[model samples]
Target: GSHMVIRESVSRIYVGNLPSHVSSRDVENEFRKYGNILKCDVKKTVSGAAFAFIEFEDARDAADAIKEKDGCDFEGNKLRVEVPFNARE
Candidate 1:
């Protein structure tokens, strides 16, 4: 039998397509369902678009949330979740 590890060592997640009314605290509250949340930030776009970045206590929690919930609907909008990777130094 094989068991899949749901969480990893990372601690950050990027979320997209958030509703305009949603706040960073709201995002954190949602993510709290999986594990401990350290911080959450909702991006304010010029064109009225919305998004968020959430940092959790466990990387695996971020990974699992992205894998299972990305592109899924929440609060009438679709979400995209991911573990953020640094592309530059």
Candidate 2:
């Protein structure tokens, strides 16, 4: 196994490389397949790149979405999903 640190009791999915026009609703709809989404948030950078934070009720759901949907096309843009090892700071 790698020496990377992993967090406990937390599953935060970082959705990046989204289409410039992708909306929060679109992200939620795509992720709803894995499980009940507790929250969906979009973060925008000054340069116009955007990312999303999708929180699921269970960690398994988060993992599933990342594994199956990461890099999949959505709204004409490819997506990248990641399970973050850090909390909101």
Candidate 3:
């Protein structure tokens, strides 16, 4: 049974298309540029994470991260940024 409440977004920003060799620390640095990082969690492949879920201290910063970072070139790949909920679709 589920007893814990899932609120306040465990990870506010969903980063996709990350480099195959990208590490959690690398993601922290990348997103740290936008705001204070609360936490960093990630990936989608065997070699390395191709995506990430980064928590931002400021929601405003998270908003900007989604807008500006989407389609931005990172590590020779186009970074796709979105809300964590977007993964549902």
Candidate 4:
């Protein structure tokens, strides 16, 4: 039998479509439920689209967050959560 195994070492998540007023603290509060957060950077564009980069201590935690929080609503806006490819080396 042949088996495939994929190992990921990066522990960063990209959160998009957030509310304009969402802050780093808000992101930390939401993402911390999954695991320990290393850093959270939230930014808003000129057009008012909000996004954030959340880094966790473990890659598994990031995966869990993406699975649970993707498409979830935050402050009346549905958030897009994913493990970005470029977040790690």
The predicted structure with the larger lDDT, 2 or 3, is 2
| Sort by lDDT, top down from the best | 4, 2, 3, 1
Between candidates 2 and 4, which one is better according to lDDT? 4
Candidate 2 regions off by >4 Å? 1-11, 20-22, 71-79, 85-89
Which lDDT value does model 1 have at 43?
Answer: 70
- Please give, for residues 1-89, the per-residue lDDT of candidate 2 as tens digits: 22343446544577676556447887688777766777788887885567888776555544665666556455656666666632221
Q: lDDT of candidate 2 vs native?
A: 0.63
lDDT of each: 0.59, 0.63, 0.61, 0.64
Pick out the ten consecutive residues of candidate 2 with the lowest summed lDDT. 1-10
Clashes of each: 3, 0, 0, 0
**lDDT against true structure, model 1:** 0.59
Per-residue lDDT of model 4, residues 1-89, tens digit only: 22334466545667777545448877678668777787888766895667787777655545565676556565665666666543223
Write down the TM-score for model 4: 0.58
Superposed by TM-score, candidate 4 places the C-alpha of residue 17 at a distance from the truth, in angstroms, of 1.1
Instruction: Please give the TM-score that candidate 1 achieves against the real structure.
Output: 0.55
Query: Where's the lowest-lDDT run of ten residues in candidate 4?
Result: 1-10
Give per-model CA RMSD: 7.2, 6.5, 7.3, 6.1
Clashes of 2: 0
- Model 1 clash tally, residue pairs: 3
- TM-scores of the models, in the given order? 0.55, 0.59, 0.52, 0.58
Alpha carbon deviation, residue 78, candidate 3 (Å): 6.1
